[PDB]
């Protein structure tokens, strides 16, 4: 993915302010709440019956932390997401068989979380820069299907 200097700046500055122990869980929990078919892949996580149970689920929060970790790594290798994501592409595509559209969905839910967390600071140009990043990460995670 190619971000202009202007966009790299937008992305990096916002990211340095992200609570990395919390934001991932907020995005994963919202993905499970808003697009409930994704819960199919998380049966071992326990109670996902209501939004409160999902958001307060310890495993959702821990797993989200790993997901955010992967986005952080991608933000650091925007020029080789394919390589950065090979192992994870193999897991999500070859092993779990997650349809790649859900990669786009999780990226958009993360964008919604960032907007909710940063408010006015998440301006339209900053959002545009993040859309390029999440589309980049989604395409790399789907490499094993291409």
């Amino acid at each position: 993915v190619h971000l202009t200097p202007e966009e790299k700046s937008a992305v990096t500055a916002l990211w340095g302010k992200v609570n990395v122990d919390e934001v991932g869980g907020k995005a994963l929990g919202r993905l499970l709440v808003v697009y409930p078919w994704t819960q199919r892949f998380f049966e071992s996580f326990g109670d996902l019956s209501t939004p409160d149970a999902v958001m307060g689920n310890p495993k959702v929060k821990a797993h989200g932390k790993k997901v955010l970790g992967a986005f952080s790594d991608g933000l650091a290798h925007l020029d080789n997401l394919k390589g950065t994501f090979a192992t994870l592409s193999e897991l999500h595509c070859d092993k779990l068989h997650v349809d790649p559209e859900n990669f786009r969905l999780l990226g958009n839910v993360l964008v919604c979380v960032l907007a909710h967390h940063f408010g006015k600071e998440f301006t339209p140009p900053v959002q545009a820069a993040y859309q390029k990043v999440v589309a980049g990460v989604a395409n790399a995670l789907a490499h094993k299907y291409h």
Binding site: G29, R30, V33, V34, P51, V54, M55, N108, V111, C112, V113, A115, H116, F118, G119, K120, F122, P124, P125, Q127, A128, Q131
Partner: protein, 141 residues
Amino acid sequence: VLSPADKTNVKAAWGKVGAHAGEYGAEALERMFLSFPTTKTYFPHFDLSHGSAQVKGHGKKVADALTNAVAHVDDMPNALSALSDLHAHKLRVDPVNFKLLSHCLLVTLAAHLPAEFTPAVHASLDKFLASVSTVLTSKYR
């Protein structure tokens, strides 16, 4: 389907938008044009730069249509029938584009309504916009 809880959640959140309806409609459009450049081609007679009176005026129209859908949520197909014919028949708007604008509307609401944009309300709004989008693309099925 939109459940009773979803209708309440949407009316509540939209209720907090208030006089800001049109401004948020315009911000959503701008976020859409910047984030998904392919959508700009539908608006040749519009200058899409920030502060554009046309995008501001059009944001008010989009908000008014969403407001009409909220107000007649149980009769959405009928309420948005003319808008459905316009976007599908005349404008030939690609169905994918409704998902894009719906996403930008959620982002705009999340950015302006911190207290209201809970996971439950986020889900209701997503379902509401999905329903609006289904109706707007129905003159394709």
